[PDB]
Amino acid sequence: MMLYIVFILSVIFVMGFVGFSSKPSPIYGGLGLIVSGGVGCGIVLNFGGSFLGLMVFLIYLGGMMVVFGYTTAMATEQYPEIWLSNKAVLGAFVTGLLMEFFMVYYVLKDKEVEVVFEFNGLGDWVIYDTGDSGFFSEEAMGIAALYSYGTWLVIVTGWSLLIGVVVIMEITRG
Amino acid sequence: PFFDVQKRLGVDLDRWMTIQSAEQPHKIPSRCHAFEKEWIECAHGIGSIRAEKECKIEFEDFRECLLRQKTMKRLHAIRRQREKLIKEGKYTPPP
Amino acid sequence: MNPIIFIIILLTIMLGTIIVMISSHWLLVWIGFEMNMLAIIPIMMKNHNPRATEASTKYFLTQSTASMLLMMAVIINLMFSGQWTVMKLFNPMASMLMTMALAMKLGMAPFHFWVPEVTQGIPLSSGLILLTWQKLAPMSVLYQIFPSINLNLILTLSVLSILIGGWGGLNQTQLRKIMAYSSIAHMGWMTAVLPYNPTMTLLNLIIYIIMTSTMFTMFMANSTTTTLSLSHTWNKTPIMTVLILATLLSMGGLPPLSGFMPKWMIIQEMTKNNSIILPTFMAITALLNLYFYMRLTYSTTLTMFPSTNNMKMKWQFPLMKKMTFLPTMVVLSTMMLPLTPMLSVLE
Amino acid sequence: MFMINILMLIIPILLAVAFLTLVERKVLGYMQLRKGPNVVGPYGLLQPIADAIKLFIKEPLRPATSSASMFILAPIMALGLALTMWIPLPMPYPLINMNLGVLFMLAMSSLAVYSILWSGWASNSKYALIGALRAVAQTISYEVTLAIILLSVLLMSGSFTLSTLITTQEQMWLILPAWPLAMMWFISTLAETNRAPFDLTEGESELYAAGPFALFFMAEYANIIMMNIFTAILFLGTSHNPHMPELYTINFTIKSLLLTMSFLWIRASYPRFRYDQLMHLLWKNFLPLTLALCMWHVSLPILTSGIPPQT
Amino acid sequence: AERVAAFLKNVWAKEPVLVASFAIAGLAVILPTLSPYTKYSLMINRATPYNYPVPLRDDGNMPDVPSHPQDPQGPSLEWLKRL
Amino acid sequence: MNLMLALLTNFTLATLLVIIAFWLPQLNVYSEKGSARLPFSMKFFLVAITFLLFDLEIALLLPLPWASQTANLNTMLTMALFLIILLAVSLAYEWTQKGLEWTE
Amino acid sequence: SMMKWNRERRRLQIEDFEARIALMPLLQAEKDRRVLQMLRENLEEEATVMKDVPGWKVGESVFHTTRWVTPMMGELYGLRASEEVLSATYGFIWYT
Amino acid sequence: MSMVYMNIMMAFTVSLVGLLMYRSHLMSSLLCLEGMMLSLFVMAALTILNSHFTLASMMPIILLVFAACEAALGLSLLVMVSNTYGTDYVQNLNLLQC
Amino acid sequence: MWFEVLPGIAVMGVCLFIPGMATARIHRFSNGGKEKRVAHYPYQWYLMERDRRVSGVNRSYVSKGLENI
Ligand SMILES: CCCCCCCCCCCCCCCCCC(=O)OC[C@H](COP(=O)(O)OCCN)OC(=O)CCCCCCCCCCCCCCCCC
Ligand SMILES: CCCCCCCCCCCCO[C@@H]1O[C@H](CO)[C@@H](O[C@H]2O[C@H](CO)[C@@H](O)[C@H](O)[C@H]2O)[C@H](O)[C@H]1O
Ligand SMILES: CCCCCCCCCCCCO[C@@H]1O[C@H](CO)[C@@H](O[C@H]2O[C@H](CO)[C@@H](O)[C@H](O)[C@H]2O)[C@H](O)[C@H]1O
Ligand SMILES: CCCCCCCCCCCCO[C@@H]1O[C@H](CO)[C@@H](O[C@H]2O[C@H](CO)[C@@H](O)[C@H](O)[C@H]2O)[C@H](O)[C@H]1O
Ligand SMILES: CCCCCCCCCCCCO[C@@H]1O[C@H](CO)[C@@H](O[C@H]2O[C@H](CO)[C@@H](O)[C@H](O)[C@H]2O)[C@H](O)[C@H]1O
Ligand SMILES: CCCCCCCCCCCCO[C@@H]1O[C@H](CO)[C@@H](O[C@H]2O[C@H](CO)[C@@H](O)[C@H](O)[C@H]2O)[C@H](O)[C@H]1O
Ligand SMILES: N=C(N)NC(=N)NCCc1ccc(I)c(Cl)c1
Ligand SMILES: N=C(N)NC(=N)NCCc1ccc(I)c(Cl)c1
């Protein structure tokens, strides 16, 4: 059901993580992270975070992950190794999927599961808020408050980014 | 803070975002505003050793609002019972 | 490095630390650590060689991992209390994660492997920062979250650090590795007393920093990084050999020198809490440190090792390195015990 | 009823791309004192059909790629994302009415660089990989100014909704208050779409085939049209009459057609930039001005008392 | 005054793009402080009612609080209608 | 649901066009006719890294259209200009340090 | 030109926002009754479903406080057709 | 807790184990580090959005910005390692063994 | 002559005209002859959901006036 969309997305989220965390060729590992990023944006979208969802796409996938792929093509892997060709990667990949499937199957059968800690399995919709009728996005109000409330945050964030530029020019000059 | 420079200078560098019952844009309240307000006012000034015992009631309620563990458990209980009756024909839901 | 850039990078290392110390918000604490780690890397890399690049990479991986674990602890704390205030955490799993993260940042055993290697691979001035200024921010967080730390975890880390630091230093001829293992041992005393009296943690931290700065500054003065190179000091700067002797004995905790004061005070606080086995075990184990401190005094000051002929050319030139604050620090490093009651200013 | 609507966007987009190949050839021809296609169908109207059929029945010569999955992925990503860029466009009503539509287009367009990168990896040739990386560097560089220019314009619009640009320009085109940004925006789209004088992928390899070649070409030309439709909305806002939405669609189409023809006009008129020179046009010319105009457009509504509404 | 004028003419001849950038950035920093309309942006932002105006319990000594929205007490937007 | 359907249609059609573009009748009956430093300049690394840092700054400027609706305009305008000026200082630093050069 | 139009647009937003303020009391009154009716209806089915479950008090709060607490989605739409639950939970987010 | 939290925490654990269990490529380990950031971003965003903690809505952005700057530093170290040895293999970074 | 470029342009223009025209008329067909309701904010969605219940046929675009008073 579409009532479990958030849960389903989080299942794919984990599968993408078991994908690159098993560490295949950095080219394929990058693909697994890109898929996870998109699935992660969808999870954030369904909780009412449109801007935060699109920042993952704009900045995390279009920004950082592009530079990761760019750097991989330059200084790491130019041609991928066959995926799951190494036994260690396959064992790790299979093990994570087997663990994940058991969690999913048990939480769906009992509508709850205790994997270390106890979780509910009724669906994530149950915790949602029931009274919204404002003429604005609350997430947008909060982020816009960076410029009124967050003067200190802007100063230290802006400073760190400038120092990042200076630092990386020092590191790479060699 | 280790060095409480903020209070010495009366300048608010990050206190504004520490709790959800603080002032928010356009007076948008957090879902657990009343519970966090109650717990904060109960525990104010008496120290964390005392508060851990004397404000346990407010903190348990605030935690229930935060994660709703007891509410979900109750809903899970009623739903599970309903499935049994549907599986036994002793209950037909209304319209 | 351009001197103005060096200054700005150094000021950013300090600013990252200060943000951690003045912050009341976990996010700003995390930012302070991130800013601090960003600025430290260039000074580790500044001599451009494969060893420096390996040291910076090992440092980056350790610190970035620890900072992710810290962020995870903060977020778990947010879910279980709905607030960001820097104070006791409201979840035992959050407390463990934050404690482990701070242990990794401090290089406490069994997360210690990076300290000897990173210190070896960077210049002396960079190692001085790494082993002194860089301990301030993680210690200042432990100072605030200790009411919620697991006692068994923190004391296990302390005991392991004193053991690993003492044993690890016995096998070293490189001065930078000796200071690294010495740092691991001293972090153990700082955290062992934290659950009982954080003021003694501050006292041990301050005295540790003063003594460590004195050693690094004296090593820089003569450009010495090995035991044998240090053993030539007697034939160039005899005064330095005496200052090293006093500082090493102080670092060994011998009375009536300054370095005895932290061990003295920590033992007192622990016994007041009916902790008798742990202080005694700690004090005996610290004799391992005293041993490899004494070995250095033998090859530096108390005997005269063989020299070289080219050393005579060095006789005709004076020391030109800054040695900033060295006269002040060496006096504090050795002659402070009569002023022990002054520790109350740290309350 | 909504699936009908999706098809009535996809199919005309692909047909418009096909016949842009004809129009580009004929406009370039007449600017070169010749005719261009005029034999295959009357006035060359069947030329796009002959080309399309030819390409698809052509032998699909793909050398043994270093990655089968990434060889297939690149054209699918390129074409799939290109069509996605159209779904929030108000013409005057969007297929999908997004509150953050402008931000959605920026985020999707930033993903299009992966098709360049993946096709470089799949080529199994360090020479083509190096060509891919040079193209990626050009593309991301000009993404910087496009985002900042777009932000500056929205400070006069008040929101990220694309249809709010229509409201903002009810009295006057935004090109009048913002012609300096329109100038750099327009050139940035040329460089973004690797169009001459920024067509350095084509020029440098001078100094894919069949259907898979055709698909990359279709995605490129879909992006070219979409960029010019975006420019018309951003700077040449058409008035919308809710009772006659087709008057908006006619006028807005003409502006987009003309803007697209100006892409062909420019291609006919200038030599090609060197790679380092189009890098300097961005980092040392556009970016300093864009940053200064971004500062100016934050201040201007505040100092004039012309802050737009949020809703 | 002249050596600066001789400086500007050189950068205007050599780097007109940079001269324009710096000129625009300076106006963006300076003009808000000089403009007489800047004060209205504050007022208009405050005049926009995003949330409900919760009424006050009347204790009998609030002569400056209107009883009805169409009464003459309370803030007026006449200044905004003209603007 | 509509956006999901649009996305699913766009990439499903793209997939169908790609596969059919690969598998069409050919009318022939005979046999058909690694992870190192790529020789690529450090300059191209610095472009990508420079793009990333500027992109992170852009993420912080994106809320500006909403921030201009605040009553705390004095603070908001000061912080917007501060961030953009710092972005300009970043560019000035790369420029004067020959980070934007392509020679050598 | 942009200044004049934007000022007019700000006046049009204020008029639109004030129409909403005029209607909020009526909408709030309606919302209160709908919520209370839904909770009451769930309380009848709870009485029936949990009639023969030992140690189950019907309608027992999970909070120590007697203050009114806003219910979450699961409490209101706990026992209703998925079509309504989906519309209530994800209808706004998914609307185009 | 809610069902989604089970998988988000699982994703973080999976990437942490991936990070602590190195293979050969340094880039593969840097990807795991970004994976932990992405899971932290999602977990923080979900918690903040669901609780309607309005002013905390900017926190995930700050997390993203700072961690991307961290990743840029990490990539720069990787290329310097690759310039030295011709690969990004961690086994080459063992000089400080002695 | 140059005007022989126009037929290709006309075909291109009609192709670009169909998307906008189709969406506009499909919206009118599916929304009772009116513009499709825009709900970017919770308030607008709340009123649209209230209209659906008030309609009596579960159609937010079916309006009820004074005849229901
Ligand atoms: C006040 C209350 C607190 C009480 C705690 C105890 C305080 C003592 C610790 C103070 C700190 C140590 C300061 C010692 C200053 C040393 C200066 C000195 O004694 O002379 C050094 C001497 C000079 O040699 P030179 O440079 O050549 O000049 C003369 C020309 N031949 O250099 C030489 O000639 C080399 C000499 C050979 C090495 C002999 C070493 C044995 C003497 C050690 C003296 C220092 C004691 C250190 C341990 C502390 C003792 C309690
Ligand atoms: C290395 C560089 C170091 C630079 C150090 C610079 C320190 C700058 C401190 C900035 C914070 C100044 O002090 C703080 O500022 C902001 C805006 O001015 C004020 O905040 C104001 O805007 C928002 C609006 O709701 C709220 O925070 C508050 O309602 C209001 O007072 C704080 O009330 C004030 O306490
Ligand atoms: C090193 C791997 C890091 C992976 C981190 C993975 C995420 C960790 C999730 C921590 C959140 C769950 O944290 C856990 O929650 C439960 C209830 O919810 C708490 O409560 C639990 O123990 C206490 C014991 O007095 C009681 O409340 C109760 O018996 C039980 O529910 C635990 O005290 C807390 O530790
Ligand atoms: C867009 C829809 C169009 C629908 C049209 C449907 C027509 C279906 C009939 C396809 C006819 C293709 O015709 C055939 O194409 C392939 C392209 O690989 C050519 O090439 C093929 O044959 C030659 C030898 O003859 C081989 O060496 C070659 O490797 C092989 O690919 C053939 O020489 C040509 O005869
Ligand atoms: C009016 C204020 C508006 C706010 C502006 C926003 C902040 C922008 C900060 C940019 C600072 C750039 O500062 C810039 O530094 C270099 C120093 O090498 C100077 O340029 C100097 O070096 C270059 C070589 O690169 C020489 O060819 C040149 O002759 C010399 O002037 C520039 O003249 C100066 O403009
Ligand atoms: C590298 C560091 C870069 C830092 C750059 C910072 C530059 C800041 C420049 C603009 C700061 C002042 O900008 C503008 O000044 C005028 C003063 O007349 C302020 O005052 C104006 O607006 C306020 C509203 O709050 C009115 O009450 C007031 O009557 C009016 O004069 C504005 O609120 C402020 O928006
Ligand atoms: N935490 C501890 N165990 N010790 C501690 N700080 N006790 C507080 C007692 C104390 C002791 C000395 C002073 I001077 C002051 Cl003012 C107060
Ligand atoms: N650049 C030009 N305009 N001429 C040109 N070489 N066109 C390419 C021809 C082409 C490619 C794909 C498709 I689908 C179609 Cl129908 C036609």
Author numbering:
A (entry chain J): 1 to 174
B (entry chain e): 1 to 95
C (entry chain N): 1 to 347
D (entry chain H): 1 to 207, 215 to 318
E (entry chain b): 1 to 83
F (entry chain A): 1 to 33, 45 to 115
G (entry chain Z): 49 to 144
H (entry chain K): 1 to 98
From the paper:
Complex I is a 1 MDa multi-protein assembly that is central to mitochondrial and cellular metabolism. It oxidizes the NADH produced by oxidation of carbohydrates and lipids to maintain the redox state of the mitochondrial NAD+ pool, reduces ubiquinone-10 to drive the respiratory chain and oxygen consumption, and pumps protons out of the mitochondrial matrix. This proton pumping contributes to the proton-motive force that drives ATP synthesis through oxidative phosphorylation. Here we define the inhibitory drug-target interaction(s) of a model biguanide with mammalian respiratory complex I by combining cryo-electron microscopy and enzyme kinetics.
Substantial evidence of disorder at the ND5 lateral helix / subunit NDUFB4 interface was observed in preliminary maps, so the dataset was subject to a separate local-first classification focusing on this region. The strategy yielded three major classes: one with a typical well-ordered ND5 lateral helix and NDUFB4, and two with distortion or disordering of ND5 residues 547-564 and nearby NDUFB4 residues 77-92. The Active-1092-ii and Deactive-1092-iv models match the well-ordered inhibitor-free active model in this region. Transmembrane subunit ND5 contains an unusual long helix that runs laterally alongside ND4 and ND2, which has been proposed to either stabilize the proton-pumping modules, or act as a transmissive element in proton pumping. Two π-bulges are stabilized by interactions between the lateral helix and nearby waters, and ionic and hydrogen bonding to ND4. Furthermore, in the classes from the lateral helix classification, density for IM1092 was observed in the Q-channel of deactive classes with both ordered and displaced lateral helix. IM1092 is observed in the ND2/NDUFB5/NDUFA11 pocket regardless of the occupancy of the Q-channel or the status of the lateral helix.
